[PDB]
Amino acid sequence: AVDNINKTIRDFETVPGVEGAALVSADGLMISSALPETEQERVAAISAGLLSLGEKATTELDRGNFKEVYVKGEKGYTLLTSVGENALLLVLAKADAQIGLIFVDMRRIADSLLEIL
Amino acid sequence: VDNINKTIRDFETVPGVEGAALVSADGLMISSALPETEQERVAAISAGLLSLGEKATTELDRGNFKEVYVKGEKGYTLLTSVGENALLLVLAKADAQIGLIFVDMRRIADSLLEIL
């Protein structure tokens, strides 16, 4: 269960444009990452912050149970998909990444990690 | 002011578009066709989506805020910057084509910026 989760998350970083991928709990704690060892505690805290305010969007405007959220800035994308209850998958990319298809890969791998986790 | 209004009734025609609104960055509604009871509330909710969208785009070094996407199982909330001091919110159905509606918003967001 643990060998197969680590390798699945790092393989995202073999797509053109993808910098990092972290599997984080809903409550802000790091499960499995390949990001720099320094930033791993502060990125897991921000991830859970983005999950909670995506929840607000969907509840408050009558849109159904939360699925996905992405933010585009000047320099790059932040991309987040729910892993059933209690977990979530983060991808960072730059402006030249092919966002619609990463969400299709993210959706399939979420349900894969959901069985073995 | 007549050329800002019906310009927001026209997105509804496109398939998958439940509702549009022009809102201020402080949370006061400018132009919308939504139920005239909800409009004050919906102006408040789009307020936070921008700020809490500016907080990921300032904490993870992604540059200036441009756009925010959320998706729920019964549909989508989309928001784009209408320059400084306003924003365009679009409620869509969970079977609409997002990549095009963004192409239609980001142009209109710079065709309302010069007359507003």
Residue numbers in the entry:
A (entry chain A): 4 to 120
B (entry chain D): 5 to 120
Pull text from the paper.
Here, we take a structural approach to assess the relatedness of these eukaryotic-like proteins in Asgard archaea, the closest known prokaryotic relatives to eukaryotes. Asgard archaea roadblock, longin and TRAPPC3 domain-containing proteins form dimers similar to those found in the eukaryotic TRAPP and Ragulator complexes. Here, we adopted an X-ray crystallography approach to compare the structures of a potential Asgard Rab small GTPase, several RBs and two TRAPPC3 proteins to their eukaryotic counterparts, with a focus on Thor and MKD1. We conclude that the emergence of these protein architectures predated eukaryogenesis, however further adaptations occurred in proto-eukaryotes to allow these proteins to regulate distinct internal membranes.
The proteins (Thor-RB and MKD1-RB) were purified, crystallized and their structures were elucidated via X-ray crystallography to 2.14 and 2.69 Å, respectively. Both proteins are homodimers formed from protomers comprised of 5-stranded β-sheets sandwiched between a single α-helix (formed between strands 2 and 3) and a pair of α-helices (formed from the N- and C-termini). We compared the structural similarities of Thor-RB and MKD1-RB with MglBs and eukaryotic RB proteins. Both proteins displayed approximately similar levels of homology with the RB proteins M. xanthus MglB and H. Sapiens LAMTOR2, matching ~110 residues with an RMSD of 1.5–1.6 Å. Lower levels of homology were seen in comparison with longin domains (86–94 residues, RMSD of 2.5-3.0 Å) and profilins (96–102 residues, RMSD of 1.7–2.7 Å). These homologies indicate that the RB fold is highly conserved between all domains of life and that the profilin and longin domains share a core structure with RB. Despite the similarity in structures, Thor-RB and MKD1-RB display different surface charge distributions. Thus, we hypothesize that MKD1-RB may be a membrane-interacting module, whereas Thor-RB, which lacks the basic patch, may be a scaffold protein for protein:protein interactions. The Odin-RBLC7 structure shares a similar homodimeric structure to Thor-RB and MKD1-RB but lacks the terminal pair of α-helices observed in the RB structures.
